[PDB]
Design a protein around this ligand. Structure first.
Ligand SMILES: [Zn+2]
Ligand SMILES: [Zn+2]
Ligand SMILES: [Zn+2]
Ligand SMILES: [Zn+2]
Lengths: 84, 85
DNA sequence: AAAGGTCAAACTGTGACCTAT
DNA sequence: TATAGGTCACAGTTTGACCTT
């Protein structure tokens, strides 16, 4: 189970138990430094089924749970896979 | 000649001579009340070729050039096409 | 002259599965 | 084994040129 939307989560990703959807979403967001805007009141419901209706709230729950921006690899460590 | 992207513009749209690209962009943005974020410093060049590279800057030139949000039809007048008496 | 409608084409994002260590 | 990035069909979104008005 993932800490952001409650889907199946095999292991931790960037510091938090997360599924492979929010894993990639958080990764892509950090990779592109993308910014989102909530069209509601910053409380859109983030479960397995409505996670993708507001990327701001999905990313605002990624940070609330405890996802780490820095664990996503940049600078020297870009395109470097596996452990270190 | 469109005031927002310098493309061909046959007539005015929501107050300003604009192309049908920036027309549809302006209409859709206001209709959906969508909001954008410039990934840069709100300085992206909006030409015919780069207009689609930053939607936030493209909408801030729509407003700077003087297109008016209110001309887009909502409430009573939505789905209403053509001119008005 | 200018409003909304249309929608094929282009464009973009998601995520199950993979490999890398 | 845990967890990093890679892949990329598949899905979802955006665009304007054109059309009806
Ligand atoms: Zn998740
Ligand atoms: Zn939201
Ligand atoms: Zn234009
Ligand atoms: Zn910009």
């Amino acid at each position: 189970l993932c800490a952001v939307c409650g889907d199946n989560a095999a292991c931790q990703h960037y510091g938090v138990r997360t599924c492979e959807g929010c894993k990639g979403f958080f990764k892509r967001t950090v990779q592109k430094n993308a910014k989102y805007v909530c069209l509601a009141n910053k409380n859109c419901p983030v479960d397995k089924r409505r996670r993708n209706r507001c990327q701001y709230c999905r990313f605002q729950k990624c940070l609330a749970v405890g996802m780490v921006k820095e664990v996503v690899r940049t600078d020297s460590l870009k395109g470097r896979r596996g452990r270190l």
